[PDB]
Symmetry: C2
Subunit: 787 residues, 2 copies
């Protein structure tokens, strides 16, 4: 499993990603003047800004009146008075440049790779008979980027290394460093406002301080450091260490003056330099392996030559190379491991990798699908602890969101809208009126995120986590919903204003944004109430609160099937402004939610399928990814493969179609431009095709493509504390292994009759209603199913 | 006439070239982090090396014996003992980086251009309603690269600028500077030998020293300089000035201790900073215009939209857009003005623009076609003084070549082989045996170069130049030829060993390199003798020498027509190892030489046409350029257009075919990679299609394509001291205007009867055969010819 090339990267999307959750780098593999793009996941512009809007509360009753009177045009216009500032932006830390003294021409067979089994990037090339090798990785245990350089001939390693950055900074020197203060404001890439990048006076800025420290250890030759960088002369081998830090305090959610980044980096560099290279690399391998090796997937032998570069592989084989599908699957797990380790910030639109001052859409946390999508594979793909950064980010939003709910809406609980940043902005964006209400006015970000808090529990069954962390936040989110819901003329509970993520409805020759009770709103709120009810009972508390949520849920405006036989996206059967809109917000209840299933709502389930069909199989990287899981839920394995085929389409940096999804040379997901959400949904989608556990039973191979004849997957997790392994041959399940962390009744759905054994002895299983079979499992024991 | 793009360059071959003959720059036009690749035309690796080989003189008689015995294999092997070192390399000075503080996103309509009428690069873009403009040019009068930056709003111009380089250097600070010593050795890009880049120890190094100096003048805001570069904060307008120099002494051909680069740049910088920006620009425009406006070409209105980017223009129209053809023509003149001003070094393989440490083929002076090609348009396109740098370089070669002639061959005169560098290496390359004799052993470099010395006289007729500069060198070249020539069995004069540039001949399956008296040898020698004879007579001297050259010439082995009816490339009718070889060395007598014409050798002339036919119309950019003029001499305008069409093929930097000629996005010629010879041949070829004067008469429209129905050209020069203007309509010459700097008899050849008038009065003309007509012209007067 490698992403490789026989040529150095020319474009950032051809570079190789490495990271330890906090520090990130993109390796180009250039022969002479190497560039290693750097990132520190807390490096953002700004500080906690006054984002709430009291005027929102003032106009709320009027906008609702307008909506009730179907004066959508006036309602959309007035909603521009219920907005807030655009969030801040994720900044590019800088570059690590290494100038080799041997020229840029090499002998044939140049090679660079990222090995997903080791998380190590290797670069090799030869000049005049002398072989040079490079090993680069970002170690979590020793908190640093490591670059190991070697020459096959003694004394043939000479270079100059130094840091640089697009951000205002000052450099200085036994280490080479850079430091400064982040800008206090950066306008989103799409908002062409005057003075897009603003630095405060270096004496009073509220921007966070940052610091980068580069050190080197030479084996042979000499080493010196001056204004021009680190100079290694006549060595044979050398190791470069880089550490970065900021004044951002994850506990307060704000910059802290008492936090000195230069002291943190020097502490980090001094520590790593005391360990030998082999020790450092081995500590990294052991750390990485414990997470990566939890899951093993095999869909068959790869039909592509082993020497082929990944870009040619994608273009010439696509999803036809089952080895490429496996690589894609594991790439998602790899990227989560390298961008979302506990204690670090959750992966943003670009994980942690970004080279642009004004990155696309601020490279922030987009809460109307993208941020959530980033974590869809956390639980199922056995990276549960990697969900923590989001969980803790949600705790912060819950804290900030309480004030937003109070000020903008006069409601209890907490709310979050469609965009959030490092600071945890919970108020809507749109710079108080500039943004389009179809996407700017959306108060369901918090309601959606509660699902992640809950899923962390459904998968791990940790009562303490639920009681002390999850439930409290989930409950507060539900309270806000109880206040956000209002009775309509008919007496049903609805939301108003209400929008369906980025999709306008049309009447006549016009398109409108806001109306009342969109299907996403109703689905998300219903799901939140359900999860809260389940949580409360599990904890045997809030008997009355449960009643209130039950009554409210019962009073929600019922979902509807439109004249096209499709699940209606709005409370009225309006015409879509775009029948192929990339978002499928009204299907959130099918996936990632579980509100609507063939069992729970047969007619709504089928109608949802019709909506998906009308929507089509095209879209951005993330849209394709969403549809993969949706169709997996619909049990259409062949359609899943088709969408998988579409995402495995080589996209280039000069792509002109704004919504042409795919992947770049380095397999990074393409919106375009680079958007990591697609990588995470591809991974989650694949798991959902092989295993599902949201309907009260473990269903095996729910959506296996007819072309995936033989294979296996080991280490997937299922709700209820289950870890599952399964294998198949000739397109049919042949063997399953289940281990539960809890003694309970296990229920499974297989298409063929299976016998159960534990320690080789038969286990009694009741073949219930359908092909569903339940049986008792004891915590820790391994149960095997055979035909 | 512009080369423009609506996008900043991502590749070097998309960047815009500017220069003043000595200082060169490639402008990318990037929005935030701008890169301006720098060059100083005397910055090369090494120093005068011990390149001659006395052993060559010892094996000369043996090799001659082996060849006579037709032991070609043993001869080729032994010729490896008659070689020398590979030349040194042209180095990349470094970069001028400008970090803007406004982010990288701009509003629609980004624009960058190189206006050939002003020699100025302009870049414009708008951010948040503020427009930023940049004007860059390299001024000859004020010896510096100038970068003018403006912002439409007060205080909105802030940036950091600094220099960097891939060469070993040290930086230091009111100006920001970098300096160092060039390596003492750089191996050619194609020679993969151990330790490709070698720097001498600083205590004894003989490499030249170099210095780059950057200064800034701000209008508004503040300015400061430190280790991080020049910092302009809150200004409105600013001008950056860059100057570079080396210890290379052009008069001695070697580095000079007394020539302090740092002092030369500070003098230049201090001086320019004292002048106002408007003053600086106008001095530049005045200087530039005086050279560029000498020639005007019109082939009709361009069919491409005025706002089209050049790369798209080439791709979509090619030679069909006559406007693009005009641009291609003038670009060649532009590049000569920017790369070869009096006092600077002659245009090398890449003019003066190079970013690579080990540039392709050392970006040196390749004398078996390329170097000569660079100056093909110097005379005919009215840029005679720009020929001087080549003339002076030839003077140096004649000096160094005398030692080579004596040591390697025991001959009089001087010799030059196929590769030369700044140091003026006149000895063969091939690292004493490594190189292939088919290209390494070729002692006709100087013999060919004498043609340029002579042409500077044929066109300008400066007797003092001929008597004191050209003739002495020409004669010394002929003297070498008299000694290099030996008698064969039949008593004919031949050369041995002899090679035909890069092409081997076959005998059975095997390919051989050396033989005796190749056609190029015989052609170049004869032309040299012919030119010397005509020079001696014009000077009325060396009556005895003339007879000696006349007799020798008459004893040269006659040229032959092969079994395919083709002009034989070798003295024996051998099989070609490659029927489509890119070189056409045996046709040098057709063009650029004038030895073989329909009048001088009708049968040979025809056979040469067959040879060309067999060779094909494909090839590298230079091959195509050569074929343009050859077909122009064959008077096949339509065929000339086919070749022109072939060169106007957009090539991209990832072109896999090593010999696919064309042009890059910035109209730079493609070999590939970038090779300027193609640009110069294209310009010269086009001129040769409209006017010829090598046969004793000014022939008008000798090879006009049928598609070039109407147009005109003004400012072309003809041998004999003539400046010509001519216009045509409906495919036929309609008007000609001639001005002679010499009172003499003028002979013209028009394919249509013309009337002659001067200041109103009819001028008597005497009709001759083949459409010719002669008439008397008085120095300075303008003679107009009408149908």
């Amino acid at each position: 499993l490698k992403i490789q090339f026989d040529f150095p990267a020319s474009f950032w999307t051809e570079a190789l990603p490495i990271g330890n959750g906090n520090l990130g780098a993109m390796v180009f593999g250039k022969v002479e003047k190497e560039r290693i793009a750097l990132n520190e996941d807390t490096l953002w512009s700004g500080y906690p800004k006054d984002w709430n809007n009291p005027k929102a509360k003032e106009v709320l009753p009027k906008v609702r009146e307008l909506i009730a009177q179907e004066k959508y045009e006036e309602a959309d216009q007035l909603s521009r008075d219920m907005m807030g500032p655009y969030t801040q932006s994720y900044l590019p830390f800088g570059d690590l440049n290494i100038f080799m003294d041997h020229g840029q021409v090499v002998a044939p067979h140049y090679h660079r790779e990222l090995d997903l089994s080791t998380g190590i990037v290797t670069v090799t090339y030869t000049i005049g008979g002398v072989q040079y090798t490079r090993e680069l990785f970002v170690t979590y245990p020793d908190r640093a980027i490591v670059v190991r350089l070697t020459a096959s001939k003694e004394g043939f390693l000479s270079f100059r290394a130094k840091l640089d950055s697009l951000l205002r900074h000052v450099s200085s020197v036994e280490h080479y460093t850079i430091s400064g203060t982040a800008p206090e404001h950066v306008s989103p890439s799409y908002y062409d406002e005057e003075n897009p990048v603003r630095y405060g006076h270096p004496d009073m800025s509220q921007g966070m301080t940052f610091h980068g420290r580069l050190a080197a250890v030479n084996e042979g030759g000499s080493l010196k450091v001056d204004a021009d960088g680190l100079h290694v002369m006549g060595a044979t081998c050398a190791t470069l260490y880089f550490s970065a830090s900021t004044s951002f305090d994850p506990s307060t959610g704000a910059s802290c003056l008492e936090r000195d980044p230069s002291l943190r980096t020097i502490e980090t560099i001094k520590a790593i330099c005391k360990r030998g290279y082999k020790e450092i690399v081995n500590r990294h391998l052991e750390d990485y392996t414990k997470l990566f090796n939890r899951v093993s997937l095999h869909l068959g032998e790869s039909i592509a030559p082993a020497d082929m570069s990944t870009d040619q592989r994608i273009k010439e084989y696509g999803s036809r190379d089952l080895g490429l599908v496996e690589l894609l699957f594991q790439y998602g797990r790899y990227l989560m491991i390298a961008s979302s380790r506990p204690g670090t910030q959750p992966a943003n639109l670009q994980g942690i990798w970004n080279e642009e001052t004004r990155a696309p859409w601020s490279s922030n946390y987009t809460l109307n699908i993208n941020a959530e999508m980033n974590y869809w594979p956390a639980e199922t793909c056995n990276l549960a602890e990697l969900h923590k950064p989001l969980i803790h980010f949600i705790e912060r939003l819950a804290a900030n969101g309480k004030k937003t709910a109070e000020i903008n809406y006069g409601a209890r609980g907490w709310v979050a809208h469609h965009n959030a940043d490092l600071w945890g902005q919970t108020a809507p964006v749109g710079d108080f009126g500039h943004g389009d209400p179809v996407w700017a006015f959306w108060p369901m970000g918090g309601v959606w995120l509660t699902q992640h808090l809950w899923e962390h529990y459904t998968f791990g069954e940790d009562e303490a986590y639920l009681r002390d962390t999850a439930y409290p936040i989930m409950k507060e989110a539900a309270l806000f919903c109880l206040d956000w819901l209002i009775e309509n003329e008919a007496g049903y509970l609805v939301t108003s204003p209400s929008t369906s993520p980025e999709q306008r409805f049309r009447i006549g020759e016009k398109g409108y944004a806001v109306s009342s009770a969109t299907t996403m709103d109703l689905s998300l709120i219903a799901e939140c109430f359900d999860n809260c009810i389940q949580a409360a009972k599990r904890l045997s508390i809030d008997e009355d609160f449960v009643k209130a949520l039950s009554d409210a849920k019962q009073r929600l405006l019922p979902l509807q099937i439109g004249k096209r036989g499709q699940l209606q996206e709005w409370s009225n059967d309006f015409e879509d402004e775009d029948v192929h809109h990339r978002h499928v917000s009204h299907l959130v209840g099918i996936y990632p939610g579980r509100l609507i299933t063939e069992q729970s709502a047969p007619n709504l389930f089928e109608a949802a399928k019709t909506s998906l069909e009308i929507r089509g199989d095209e879209g951005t990287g993330w849209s394709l990814g969403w549809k993969i899981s949706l169709w997996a839920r619909f049990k259409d394995g062949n359609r899943c493969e088709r969408l998988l085929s579409n995402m495995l389409t080589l996209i280039k940096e000069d792509e002109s179609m704004q919504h042409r999804g795919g992947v770049y040379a380095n397999l990074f997901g393409a919106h375009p431009p680079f958007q990591i959400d697609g990588n995470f949904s591809a991974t989650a989608g694949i798991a959902e095709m092989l295993l599902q556990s949201h309907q009260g039973y473990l269903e095996f191979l729910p959506a296996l493509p007819d072309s995936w004849k033989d294979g296996y997957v080991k280490g997937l997790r299922g709700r209820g504390g289950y870890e599952v392994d399964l294998a198949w041959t000739n397109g049919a399940l042949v063997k399953v292994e289940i281990v539960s962390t809890k003694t309970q009744t296990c229920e499974v759905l297989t298409r063929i009759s299976m016998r159960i054994t534990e320690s080789g002895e038969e286990v009694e299983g009741d073949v219930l209603d359908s092909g569903r079979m339940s049986f008792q499992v004891e915590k820790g024991k391994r149960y095997v199913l055979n035909r």
